């Protein structure tokens, strides 16, 4: 009834669309720890016993999955872990030498993808130099009959450690305390713009870091309908992402079996190559169910008519570019496949199909990751036949007729993380209160309801990779003590509802009690009061020291 | 009423725990155990506890493992900036060494060709190696160039030990034990909390501990297992014996350049006539000490005739006495000392010949090694024999395990994690053995200690301590007892947990005894207090707005 007097609130659901550091949470079980992985450390903390999710009500937030923070953070972290895993492994320094190559002639027949190359190379004994003969792919070998390695222009080659594996391990990207990841329950949401009901998670489902071009593999499945994601309908340069309604089983193989030959370069260092191939040479086939593929592609066509109307649409093979862009490039079973995806999107097919669509593929030892210069890996030849069954669960297209597009490893991380957003809980709020001195459950709910449910938010707020985890920890400590000592300078440290001895001001706002505590939300409230937070803080701590010194003087007789 | 729940923050309680540990070198800059180690505090504080008994296992100590890892870290950080002599690996023609004054059996000059700092032409380099390092193929090669590679020591840095004072991070304490007669294993009768251990020299020795700690009263022997021959036996001698070692000749030093910015140090021709390198000990002192040792072995290990025999055999680092004299490693054949019935005249010193080795493959690791630089001129060393290492077979000397070297000095200390959170019924660490009613006076003193790449390691330990303090504060806030030692009333104590009577709890037992009595159930009461604070908080919320 009297004049409005201030009250501070610790733990009200509030956020700002912010940026922060996120720390990995690798899968808990031990066999994957044994199966050493480039993508996932063992130092990465185990996943939670219960991956937890809670759903909000009456809240709508804007998501921009094109400009979201998971994508940058995952790209940087995955490059860092790549470099870390490659660092101990040998640098194949004496590889970049002239080579005498001729096409490989197996005892059965000739191979199109291979040439036997003899060259001279200096070993751990510098005096000894002798001829060394090893196989090499045609794609990786650049001509000058004398060939050299393609990436001798870019960098000295680094061998992948056969100990470590390229297999995608689910990474639970998890945020420090004081930050909460916001998911969108709307299955049909295009990923851009508002989402009508959202969910708060302490951390995300396990995301597989999977390199793929022109298609998405082992990705998430749209539960209701096939979905299109578009940065800009008008602009052609932007990228179109198809999230597929249902999986399209892709079966890939290298039919032959490969023999690993080791050559010593250093003490405890060798270069691994493929020897002679056993068995009759046969091409690498990545075949897909044809009726399924046709029905799906046509469902893409039907769904896509709405977002670009009254125009004939034809999927066309990509015109040209580097092999990572034009051809579907991905790794399964520890080897790199590059598959001509022309036949899948070829307009030659007139809708008639009865048996598996076949795609020839080629395999490359030397790969430049993330399109960077300065780095180049040597894939050791996996021994035996590999046969990997994967799910086609998404496509990458671009308008000039829509063609497949590839090479943007950032977009693979975009396609999985379309729904998650970092938000920084700024737990401090200011408002008048009835009782006047002399996780995120109640976001959209009424203000008094949040005043009751403040305890849950407080409880959750209470509680370079090693350096990254340490950074997350100390950020939690610094934020916690920042808030606690600000409360101490406000007079109610350890109390969530800090009734204050300070009057409110008409200048800050003239809103009535019913308006703020019935209709306005904490985000709307922060919008109203966000311009005057500093001044209220300073004059509140002034009021505290004034009151305390007055009480000390009155205490003194 | 009956005794009901009460928290006690900062009371003396320890569980036998493992935590991280950091170096602290000497404060003086004369030695300026590299320099990145923090300087020690002026006063290593030590406080003896009354009525407290702790079971020290000399062989299941965590700090010996942490010491091994940390000193490996020191050594690898030292070696990493230094040069890697990978190009040294060439075929090597060799020939015996004939100085102008006499001939040497131990040596050979070898001639070999490399590349200059200018990247095309070099010239013949004739440098001198021992017979122990080189391996024939009459063309020779270094000992381990195929399986491993050799990392030259930085010529500036020296390998002599500096005393490291390991200190417990905040919330953790080191517990020395002050019983003088003690065999490492089992209870020790009275103990002392120490902020940091006494400065341990990272000394490398085999069969004869050097520059170590002295037995204060009598020669004391420790056992890892009486009934089994594998497990090792420690001897820690009272008084001492001077071991006096020399390098008789003058070896030149020749700096040969490998490439631009890389140079390694060989010897070149010797000056003076070659004399066998050797080390001697006083005969009478050795005989007295060894007779005492045999008598002690008779005393503890009963009824058996005990005899000392030389080491059986193996690589020269195994059978003999390895040690770093004057920044150079030698290996002294101990056929003189431990062999009985040689019938020494006892007036002359007992003399052991020694072989100096260039390439040191220590730390029980393959794939990494050192080319110790040849120090110029004579070297003299005069050190103690403060302990011996033997095994049951007869009793024979052994070596090669640096973990045992680190075991010998740290036999007194054990780490303990102070958990301030003491939960009891109710109506620096000196008062641990005292009563709880008396020990609650001094809980503030233990509370004080909770606050007070190796930079990153000690930062991680400090952050561990910080989040430990904040875990304590977080738990007390979840219980509502935060910021204070003793709380209010009205939370009952379930009888099933413990059965002692009201009066005898305080006076009779120690805090550790109560911890053992109450250890299992702690999680249950942490839940019941948690939910109690929640429901009381709900009631207090009903009180907050009236």
């Amino acid at each position: 009834m009297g004049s409005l007097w201030v009250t501070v609130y610790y733990g009200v659901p509030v956020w700002r669309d912010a940026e922060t550091t996120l720390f990995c949470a690798s899968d808990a079980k031990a066999y994957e720890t044994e199966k050493h992985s480039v993508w996932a450390t063992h130092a990465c903390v185990p996943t939670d016993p219960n991956p937890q999710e809670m759903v909000l009500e009456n809240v709508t937030e804007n998501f921009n999955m094109w400009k979201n923070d998971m994508v940058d953070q995952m790209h940087t972290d995955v490059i860092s872990i790549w470099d870390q895993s490659l660092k101990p492994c040998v640098k194949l320094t004496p590889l970049c030498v002239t080579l005498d190559c001729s096409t490989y002639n197996n005892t059965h027949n000739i191979s199109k993808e291979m040439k036997i190359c003899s060259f001279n190379m200096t070993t751990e004994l510098r005096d000894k130099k002798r001829k060394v003969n090893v196989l090499f792919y045609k794609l990786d070998l650049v001509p000058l009959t004398n060939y050299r390695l393609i990436s001798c222009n870019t960098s000295t080659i680094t061998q992948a450690c056969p100990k470590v594996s390229f297999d995608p391990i689910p990474i639970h990207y998890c945020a420090p305390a004081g930050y909460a990841i916001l998911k969108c329950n709307n299955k049909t949401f295009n990923g851009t713009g508002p989402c009508n009901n959202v969910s708060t998670v302490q951390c995300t489902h396990g995301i597989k870091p999977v390199v793929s071009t022109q298609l998405l593999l082992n990705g998430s499945l749209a539960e209701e309908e096939i979905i299109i994601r578009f940065e800009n309908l008008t602009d052609n340069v932007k990228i179109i992402i198809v999230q597929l309604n249902e999986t399209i089983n892709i079966t890939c193989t290298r039919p032959n079996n490969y023999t690993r030959k080791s050559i010593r370069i250093g003490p405890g260092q060798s270069f691994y190559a493929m020897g002679e191939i056993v068995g009759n040479i046969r091409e690498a086939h990545c075949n897909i169910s044809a009726s399924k593929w046709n029905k799906t592609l046509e469902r893409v066509r039907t769904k896509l008519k709405e977002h670009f109307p009254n125009k004939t649409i034809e999927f066309e093979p990509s015109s040209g570019g580097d092999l990572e862009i034009t051809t579907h490039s991905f790794n399964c079973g520890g080897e790199f496949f590059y598959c001509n995806t022309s036949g899948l999107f070829n307009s030659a097919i007139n809708g008639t199909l009865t048996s598996n669509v076949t795609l020839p593929c080629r395999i490359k030892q030397i790969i430049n990751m993330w399109q960077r210069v300065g780095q180049a890996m040597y894939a050791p030849p996996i021994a035996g036949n590999i046969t990997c069954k994967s799910n086609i669960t998404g496509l990458l297209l671009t308008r000039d007729t829509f063609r497949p597009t590839g090479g943007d490893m950032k977009n693979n991380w975009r396609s999985e993380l379309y729904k998650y957003k970092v938000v920084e809980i700024k737990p401090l709020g200011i408002a008048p209160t009835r009782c006047k001195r002399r996780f995120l459950g109640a976001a959209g709910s009424t203000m008094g309801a949040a005043s009751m449910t403040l305890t849950v938010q407080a409880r959750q707020l209470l509680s370079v990779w090693g350096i990254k985890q340490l950074q997350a920890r100390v950020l939690a400590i610094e934020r916690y003590l920042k808030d606690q000592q600000l409360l101490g300078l406000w007079g109610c440290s350890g109390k969530l509802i800090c009734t204050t001895n300070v009057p409110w001001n008409a200048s800050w706002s003239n809103k009535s009690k019913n308006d703020i505590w019935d209709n306005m939300t904490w985000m709307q409230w922060d919008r109203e009061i966000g311009n005057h937070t500093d001044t209220i803080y300073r004059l509140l701590e002034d009021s505290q020291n004034q009151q305390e010194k007055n009480e000390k003087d009155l205490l003194c007789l | 009423g009956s005794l009901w729940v009460t928290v006690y923050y900062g009371v003396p309680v320890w569980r036998d725990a493992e935590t991280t540990l950091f170096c602290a070198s000497d404060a003086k800059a004369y030695e300026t155990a590299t320099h990145a180690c923090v300087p020690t505090d002026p006063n290593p504080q030590e406080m003896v506890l009354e009525n407290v008994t702790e079971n020290f296992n000399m062989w299941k100590n965590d700090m010996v493992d942490q010491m091994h890892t940390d000193v490996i870290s020191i050594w690898d950080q030292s070696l990493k900036p230094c040069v890697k002599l990978t190009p040294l690996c060439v075929t090597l023609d060799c020939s015996t060494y004939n100085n102008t004054h006499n001939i040497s059996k131990e040596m050979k000059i070898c001639s070999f060709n490399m590349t200059t700092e200018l990247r095309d032409k070099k010239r013949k380099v004739n440098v001198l190696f021992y017979k122990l390092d080189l391996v024939p193929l009459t063309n020779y090669r270094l000992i381990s160039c195929n399986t491993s590679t050799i990392t030259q020591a930085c010529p500036k840095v020296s390998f002599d030990p500096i005393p490291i004072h390991y200190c417990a991070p905040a919330g953790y304490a080191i517990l020395k034990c002050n019983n003088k007669t003690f065999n490492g294993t089992g209870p020790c009768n009275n103990v002392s909390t120490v902020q940091c251990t006494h400065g341990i020299k990272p000394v490398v020795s085999t069969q004869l501990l050097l520059n170590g700690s002295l037995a204060e009263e009598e020669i004391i022997i420790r056992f890892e297992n009486l009934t089994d021959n594998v497990k090792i036996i420690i001897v820690q001698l009272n008084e001492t014996i001077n071991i006096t070692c020399t390098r008789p000749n003058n070896y030149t030093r020749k700096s040969i350049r490998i490439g631009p910015g890389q140079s390694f140090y060989a010897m070149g021709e010797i000056v003076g006539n070659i004399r066998e390198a050797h080390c001697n000990i006083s005969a009478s002192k050795w005989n007295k000490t060894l007779e005492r040792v045999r008598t002690k072995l008779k005393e503890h290990f009963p009824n058996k005739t005990i005899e000392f025999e030389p080491s059986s055999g193996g690589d020269l680092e195994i059978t003999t006495h390895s040690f770093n004299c004057g920044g150079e490693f030698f290996y002294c054949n101990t056929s003189g000392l431990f062999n009985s019935a040689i019938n020494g005249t006892l007036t002359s010193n007992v003399t052991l010949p020694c072989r100096i080795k260039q390439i040191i493959n220590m730390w029980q690791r393959v794939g990494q090694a050192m080319y110790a630089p040849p120090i110029a001129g004579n070297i003299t060393c005069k050190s103690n024999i403060t302990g011996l290492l033997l095994t049951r077979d007869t009793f024979r000397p052994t070596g090669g395990d640096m973990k045992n070297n680190w075991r010998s000095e740290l036999y007194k200390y054990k780490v303990v994690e102070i958990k301030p959170l003491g939960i009891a019924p109710t109506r620096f660490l000196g008062a641990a053995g005292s009563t709880m009613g008396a020990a609650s006076m001094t809980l503030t003193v233990q509370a004080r200690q909770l606050l007070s790449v190796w930079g990153i390691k000690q930062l991680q330990a400090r952050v561990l301590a910080i989040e430990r303090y904040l875990k304590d504060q977080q738990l007390l806030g979840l219980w509502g007892c935060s910021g204070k030692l003793i709380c209010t009333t009205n939370v009952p104590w379930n009888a099933s947990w413990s059965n002692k009577s009201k009066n005898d709890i305080w006076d009779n037992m120690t805090w550790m005894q109560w911890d053992r009595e109450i250890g299992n159930h702690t999680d249950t009461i942490y839940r019941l207090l948690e939910d109690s604070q929640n429901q009381q908080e709900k009631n207090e919320k009903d009180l907050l707005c009236l």
Partner: antibody
Amino acid sequence: VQLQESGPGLVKPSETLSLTCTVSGGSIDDYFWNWVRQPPGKPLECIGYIFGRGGGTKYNPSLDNRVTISTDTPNQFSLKLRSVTVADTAIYYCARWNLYDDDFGYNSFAVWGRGVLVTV
Amino acid sequence: DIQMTQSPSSLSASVGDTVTITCQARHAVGKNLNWYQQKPGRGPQLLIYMASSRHSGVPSRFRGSGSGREFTLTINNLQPEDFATYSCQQGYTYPWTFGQGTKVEM
């Protein structure tokens, strides 16, 4: 890679012994090639080990002045022993020490052959 | 040459065994131990390569651990294929000796 032994079913005492091990899967690598004899209910024992194709060889002084390792063809590597004795009767095997750090299995007999029993 | 021992010399149980080993000679060889499994009348194959972690192919049931003279191998949740011999091995010097052979049955 698959490894297999080859030799005589029976030897007589005081007669020379020979054995040949075959790496079927691929050519003879640069890894360490080993013979690991298993005596009847007693610990296994090394004989002569060669670092690849025509590399240096380390033999055992426990079986002094009898062992020899030599290679003939890129898929065969052989052991030869002279002046055998009755105590040598055992099951022989061939195996491979992984000298290099990053390969799965390091300084370890990774792939062994099935082995052959010699009576002597 | 190094002498080698194992304990128990021949165990007999199904699930949860533990093969401790004392290998004597110069103790604390490092992490330079290699376990093996030899099926009856068959070639042995690798289990643990540094007393550290499992080899490729051998499951997580088989593990090796310990530094110092007290190297150890633990097998958990044994299946019928698990029952076979296991031996100590060194890595320092050229003659790598083996343990007498710890046997597990039933």
